[PDB]
Amino acid sequence: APDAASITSSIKYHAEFTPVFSPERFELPKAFFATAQSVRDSLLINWNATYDIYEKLNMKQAYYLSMEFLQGRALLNAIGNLELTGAFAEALKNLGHNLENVASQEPDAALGNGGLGRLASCFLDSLATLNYPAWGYGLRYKYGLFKQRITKDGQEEVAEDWLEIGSPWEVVRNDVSYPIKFYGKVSTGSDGKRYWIGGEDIKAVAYDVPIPGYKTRTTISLRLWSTQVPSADFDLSAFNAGEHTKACEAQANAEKICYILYPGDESEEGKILRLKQQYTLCSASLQDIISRFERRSGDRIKWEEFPEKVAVQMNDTHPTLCIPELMRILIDLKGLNWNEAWNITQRTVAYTNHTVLPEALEKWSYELMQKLLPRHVEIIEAIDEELVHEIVLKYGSMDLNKLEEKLTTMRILENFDLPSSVAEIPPKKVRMANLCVVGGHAVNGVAEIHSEIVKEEVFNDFYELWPEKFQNKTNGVTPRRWIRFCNPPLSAIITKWTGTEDWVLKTEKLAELQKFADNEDLQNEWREAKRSNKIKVVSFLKEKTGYSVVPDAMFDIQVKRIHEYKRQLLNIFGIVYRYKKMKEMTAAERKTNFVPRVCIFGGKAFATYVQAKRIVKFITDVGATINHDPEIGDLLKVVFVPDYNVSVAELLIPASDLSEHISTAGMEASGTSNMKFAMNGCIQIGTLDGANVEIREEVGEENFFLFGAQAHEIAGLRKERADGKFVPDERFEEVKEFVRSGAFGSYNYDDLIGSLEGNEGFGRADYFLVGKDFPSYIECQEKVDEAYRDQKRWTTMSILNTAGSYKFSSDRTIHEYAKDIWNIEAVEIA
């Protein structure tokens, strides 16, 4: 049991004896690594304790595969779970530091981007907190996706620096390498089996990132792969001949696999890279898993037993190749018969779909996949025939016209001849999501509504063939990180008023506050914790944005990907209006009409999404004009927080008042940010889509600002536009002409306002009904104004947001996955 003094010794020890700096003084950078490595000593004891048990017991284990994990800062949560936040903060005071300044140093480990990541991350938290044997597998990205710079011109992008000095967490296993292969050819041995040789050979090496659980010893892995070449593959002959580039070809191709997340794929090159990324993650991971099986088996190796021991969850369509791969392994190497193998595959692999719209499901070039994975392309032609012959066995061929509709929808091979058929240059493609349904024993959406959309729209024919497959597992975000750690003054309120700490685990007890939401003592405590959390943000803002804001205003946050469809353009238009009105006022009138506000925008645009970037540009120009208008004072501020990520969120969220999720209704599959915002008492404003539904519900209709069109209407409202039947509001045109006046800088936004106007055109005619939803929105904002003025009401609305969250704990979501897909029971670690 470590004490503050023992820890101080550990920090010192590392600071000197395993250093990455000069030995002079104890500056922050050094202080972090020393502190971090001190933690990691503990993390390892448990990682080993855990490894041993999982190994000796030989029970089932789950393997969560994801192209992205968005782990963020590991430090505070690592020490939190260990229950040492106090010994560490005292030992750091002894060494002339404070914990928050030490945590400041750590970069966000950039191995992911979006919810897809953050989910996968949250999940690992749970999986370990609850003692469930499961690892995460991912790529180890050098340069993340990118870092965002907000400048006079808008967004600029620069490669991430997180591994500049290296990561103090990761533990490199050099005896864990697996061979990967691309290109080359296949041929049949005189034993029978097929043999895939030639092309390129590279290596994949394991780096384990420990994950510890809250109040438990259970410590699992996020094993990230790193691609490279053996040194011998350096061409000396050429390097010395002068051709330096030519000599590095080998390792440069082999390494670029792990450079950036989601590489540009416009060119053939980008595509091949993407594909490599995928196949690597798959083959590497599976290989490692199989090896662990074999090892744990000993003499009694029963391939029968595989799916009873292992479960592989493809987080979206990326890890798809797990299927043709696991088959290839079990056929060409393990030497089992096609069926036996296919059985084991189906019974191990599971799909988790994330997309709403058939077209967001990934489709590959045949000739490409052919040329890169030519053994896999054969296994995929065999799984397409197994399907074509079971669609012939069901339904039959009385209809012919319906057997052709069934085959067209469900066949994995697009634009092909059928095998043996009856009926008396479009480019060949491979549908991945199709292959995912066919191979896996389970398919799951991520929200009630979505999981139904998959059954009754996305995968209909499939649903009817195997309805037993389809499931739902509504998203959740971990409360450790998103409450207990990121928001301590709330966490104290919560512990006091529920009477124990146990709520960090037993998150249901969140609801026990329902009965106090009226209380004036809890109200004051609540409003005090929320200021407290905002005070920290005023500083961060000053710093990163260059703007001073008051803490006595509403914090109005829209942090999520900058896309037309998320409709930041809407939020800002909402601001632009509230401003314009302010200007046509008096001082007396202004204070009366509007409440003091700080409208926080955040998130990353594409690179070549001309418009997305023109928006961030707009937002900044708006803010500029406003924040430095002398008449506005502190009644309104508009900033744009640069380089939004886990940490940024860990600071904005605990200090939000209102959080927008105003995406064109029905397009959003779930959402995670809200689930957080909710937990921290933030009041949400949104259209009725994704989670917005399930949150609104769980928290109460009178605790969530709704507005705009709904799912059903959209087809019709787009028809109205399409026929020249839309009449805009006159306040919308008021904003539009105001921008064309030049009231926000000399930057011309005529091409921005262009995409809003017309009836037709790929980038015209306001496809996302910003014009349509505008009135209902700005009206809804008046209602927020109204609501905030009643502070007693507002505070209650907040308290209830928190009380109604407890079902969005990832703990729940996982329990569901663990019990209803993977079939894994807990493992106690004594």
Binding site for its own copies (CB under 8 A): 16-23, 29-30, 41, 44, 48, 51, 143, 146, 157-161, 164-165, 171-176, 230-232, 234, 236-237, 239-245, 248, 252, 256, 259-260, 263-264, 266-270, 273, 607
CB 226, min distance to its own copies, A: 13
Query: How far apart are CB 710 and its own copies at their closest, in Å?
Result: 37
Residue with smaller CB distance to its own copies, 49 or 714: 49
User: How many CB atoms are closer than 10 A to CB 176?
Assistant: 16
Q: Of 479, 395, 380, which Cα lies nearest the Cα of 432?
A: 380
Shortest CB 333 distance to its own copies, Å: 22
Q: Say how many C-beta atoms besides its own lie within 10 A of residue 43's C-beta.
A: 22
- Helices then strands, counting H and E runs in the chain, come out as 32, 22
CB of 217 to its own copies, least distance (A): 16
> What is the spatial distance between Cα 259 and Cα 118, in angstroms, rounded to a whole number?
20
What residues contact residue 742 under an 8 Å CB cut-off, 6+ apart?
A: none
| Strand 310-315 with 61-65, pairing | parallel
In the bound state with its own copies, the residue whose beta carbon lies nearer, of 368 and 688, is 368
DSSP assignment string, 669-720 = ---SHHHHHHHTTPEEEE-S-THHHHHHHHH-GGGSEE-S--TTHHHHHHHH
Contact 752, 616 (CB under 8 A): no
Contact 272, 369 (CB under 8 A): no
Q: Which is nearer to its own copies, 137 or 351 (CB)?
A: 137
Paired strand residues for 134: 62
- Judged by beta carbon, residue 86 or residue 230, the one nearer its own copies is 230
Q: How far apart are CA 634 and CA 652, in angstroms?
A: 19
For 534-539, which contacts have Cβ atoms below 8 Å and span 24 or more sequence positions? 534/655, 536/651, 536/655, 537/651, 537/652, 537/655
Q: Nearer Cβ to its own copies, position 171 or 301? A: 171
Q: Which amino acid is at 628?
A: H
Task: Report helix, strand or coil for 395.
Answer: coil
Cα–Cα–Cα angle for 94, 99, 103, rounded to 5 degrees = 135
Contact criterion met (CB below 8 Å) for 771 and 726? yes
Question: Of these residues, 371, 544, 561, 718, which one is catalytic?
Answer: 561
Choice between 140 and 481, CB closer to its own copies: 140
Sign of the CA dihedral with 763 first, then 764, 766, and 767 last: negative
Based on the residue annotation, tell me whether 560 is a catalytic residue of this protein.
Answer: yes
The H or E element containing residue 284 is: helix 268-297
CA-based nearest residue to 803, from 502, 477, 511: 511
Active-site entry in 73, 560, 613, 661: 560
8-state DSSP, 428: P
CB of 208 to its own copies, least distance (A): 9
* Nearest by Cα to 221 from 229, 230, 233, 210: 210
Instruction: Sort 253 into a burial class: Cβ within 10 Å, 0-12 / 13-18 / 19+.
Output: middle
Longest dimension (CA), the chain: 93
Residue 637 catalytic?
Answer: no
What the block records as the tokens of 788 is 């905030």
**Other Cβ atoms within 10 Å of 181 Cβ, number:** 16
Shortest Cβ distance from residue 234 to its own copies (Å)? 4
What tokens appear for 331 in the block? 């056929």
Q: What is the DSSP letter of 771?
A: H
Of 25 and 628, which CB lies nearer to its own copies in the complex structure? 25
Which is the catalytic residue, given 40, 274, 376, 566?
A: 566
Residues 6+ apart with CB under 8 A from 518: 796
Pairing of strands 554-559, 597-602: parallel
HSE, side-chain direction, 13 A CA sphere, residue 301 = 10
From the candidates 14, 406, 676, 696, which is the catalytic residue? 676
Least distance CB 300 / its own copies (angstroms): 20
Task: State how far the Cα of 226 lies from the Cα of 790, in Å rounded to an integer.
Answer: 55
Active-site residue identified among 354, 376, 481, 614:
354
Closest CA to 766 of 812, 710, 823, 726: 726
CA distance 486 to 256: 35
Interatomic CA distance for residues 80 and 484, integer angstroms = 9
Nearer to its own copies (CB atom), residue 44 or residue 624: 44
Q: Which is nearer to its own copies, 261 or 344 (CB)?
A: 261
Which CB sits closer to its own copies, 29 or 761?
Answer: 29
The nearest distance, CB 267 to its own copies, in angstroms, is 3
Task: Identify which of residues 205 and 379 has a Cβ nearer to its own copies in the complex.
Answer: 205
566 as an active site residue: the answer is yes
How is 351-414 classified by DSSP, letter by letter? EE---SSTTSS-EEEHHHHHHHSTTHHHHHHHHHHHHHTTTTTTT-SSSSHHHHHHHHHH-SEE
The CA distance from 537 to 555, in Å, is 10
* Residue closer to its own copies (CB basis): 175 or 191: 175
Strand pairing category for 554-559 and 413-414:
unpaired
| Six token digits for residue 289 | 């898993």
**Residue 93: active-site member:** no
Judged by beta carbon, residue 264 or residue 489, the one nearer its own copies is: 264
Catalytic residue among 620, 672, 687, 796: 672
Cross-strand partners of 350: 313
Active site residues: 354, 560-561, 566, 672, 676
